[PDB]
């Protein structure tokens, strides 16, 4: 039960919408793990001055190796010094193609399963929309160029068009009825049943959440969810650099440079596993093309304008399309929003003029404009959408460097003891 010093530096960088691992540490059952990270985060040089600050999120999860290797792990630990070695997973034969899990692809082109599987588990349990397809690549080598190097894509910050009710939301519930009569008792049950269905669709799609519904609870082992140990978030601001020569005089370049601390309070590691810490930089989806929902409606009806409570609480969801929110909105992208939601929140505004000035991190094209009539593709952040505003991604879009001070108490014979025989 002595101290092991695992502190270390980390220089990293990535694409906008994608979730990248910035530091992982293997731990052992019985370990007491504490982590205090501190550093600075920056963005590649901007074409113009500063406009809006990006929002940065840092996470640190704990994942039991058992969650990865399954029964195979249990045997491993059980059989002890007789265990059949754990298998490695494969990566594409390229240095960077392991980037998502924070490591260079080693000489043999394969990395420990716990890195890959954890990243997956983390993504599937907290980052993707609950209704989106569960991410299930088997090997880092099954990942595509972008994903493998920069991490998976995550959802845009929540707004009316990026947080629609799950696409399969019921818009009407049918109930059969005998040719001339209706069982009012059945109708009653019908509603009840519906209620359970809705609650589920709207917010209890995950087992754990259903059980919470009953006022019960579930261990993280129940559904194999990575354990979130610490979540930090902050805005990334900086300064402008003044141009001073004959032609650059009166010009500006935004240099974003933000300092930040991410500290995990002493945590007890019950079983062997990994402590992964990842980052995610995003820009609120402002767009000179989005307009208030009501500004777009052609026939304004009492139900739209009035804001009559009696109606707002008993109507079904409303199906509308991106065309109804952005001028160049794609009509093929349908979303189901809650009635009179446009009266519950206001959207950001950008004069159409900024629409074509390179250097602003605004979405100068309605979301999903180049991914086709596909909702998921519009919701997930497309990092290219930002290529336009950077002088040059020599270090991708963002980048950072920080010191990770890690102290871990654990049973560990001194190096002297290891190297000495008698």
């Amino acid at each position: 039960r002595e101290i092991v010093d695992l502190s270390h530096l980390a220089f990293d960088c990535g694409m906008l919408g994608r979730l990248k691992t910035v530091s992982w540490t293997p731990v052992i059952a019985g370990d007491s793990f504490e982590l205090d990270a501190v550093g600075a985060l920056r963005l590649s040089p901007l074409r113009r001055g500063l406009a809006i600050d990006s929002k940065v999120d840092f996470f640190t999860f704990y994942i039991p190796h058992r969650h990865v290797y399954g029964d195979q792990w249990i045997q491993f630990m059980r059989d002890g010094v007789n265990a059949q070695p754990l298998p490695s997973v494969t990566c594409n034969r390229y240095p960077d193609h392991a980037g998502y899990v924070g490591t260079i692809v080693p000489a043999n082109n394969r990395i420990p399963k716990f890195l890959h599987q954890s990243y997956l588990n983390i993504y599937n349990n907290y980052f993707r929309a609950p209704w989106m397809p569960e991410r299930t690549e088997a090997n880092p080598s099954n990942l595509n160029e972008d994903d493998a190097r920069y991490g998976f894509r995550c959802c845009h910050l929540k707004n009316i068009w990026s947080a629609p009710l799950p696409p399969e939301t019921k818009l009407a519930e049918e109930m059969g009825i005998e040719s001339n009569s209706i069982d009012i008792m059945g109708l009653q049950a019908a509603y009840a049943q519906l209620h359970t269905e809705q609650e589920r669709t709207y917010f209890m799609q995950r087992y754990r959440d259903v059980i919470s519904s009953f006022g019960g609870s579930t261990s993280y082992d129940a559904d194999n969810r990575p354990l979130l140990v610490m979540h930090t978030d902050f805005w990334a601001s900086g300064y402008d650099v003044d141009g001073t020569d004959q032609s650059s005089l009166g010009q500006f370049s935004g240099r974003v440079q933000q300092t930040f601390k991410h500290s995990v309070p002493r945590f007890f590691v019950p079983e062997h596993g990994v402590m992964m810490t990842l980052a995610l930089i995003r820009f609120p989806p402002i767009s000179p093309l989005e307009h208030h929902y009501l500004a777009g409606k052609s026939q304004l009806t009492y139900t739209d304008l009035a804001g009559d409570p009696a109606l707002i609480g008993n109507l079904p969801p409303r199906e509308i399309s991106y065309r109804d929110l952005f001028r160049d909105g794609r009509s093929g992208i349908k979303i189901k929003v809650a009635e009179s939601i446009w009266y519950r929140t206001h959207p950001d505004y950008v004069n159409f003029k900024y629409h074509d000035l390179h250097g602003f991190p605004f979405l100068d094209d309605a979301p999903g404009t180049s991914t086709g009539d596909n909702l998921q593709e519009a919701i997930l952040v497309r990092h290219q959408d930002y290529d336009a505003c950077f002088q040059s991604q020599q270090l991708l879009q963002w980048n950072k460097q920080a010191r990770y001070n890690v102290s871990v108490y654990r049973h560990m014979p001194t190096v002297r003891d290891s190297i000495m025989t008698s």
């Binding site: 101290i3 010093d5 502190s7 530096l9 600075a40 460097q401 010191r403 001070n405 001194t414 002297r416």
Partner: peptide, 24 residues
């Protein structure tokens, strides 16, 4: 962003490097 420029010392804990004697 003071520490972030300098690689930690790993001064906490016991001795790790045995290399035959003192080496600067």
């Amino acid at each position: 962003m003071k520490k972030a420029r300098r690689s930690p010392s790993r001064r906490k804990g016991a001795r790790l490097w045995y290399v035959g004697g003192s080496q600067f």
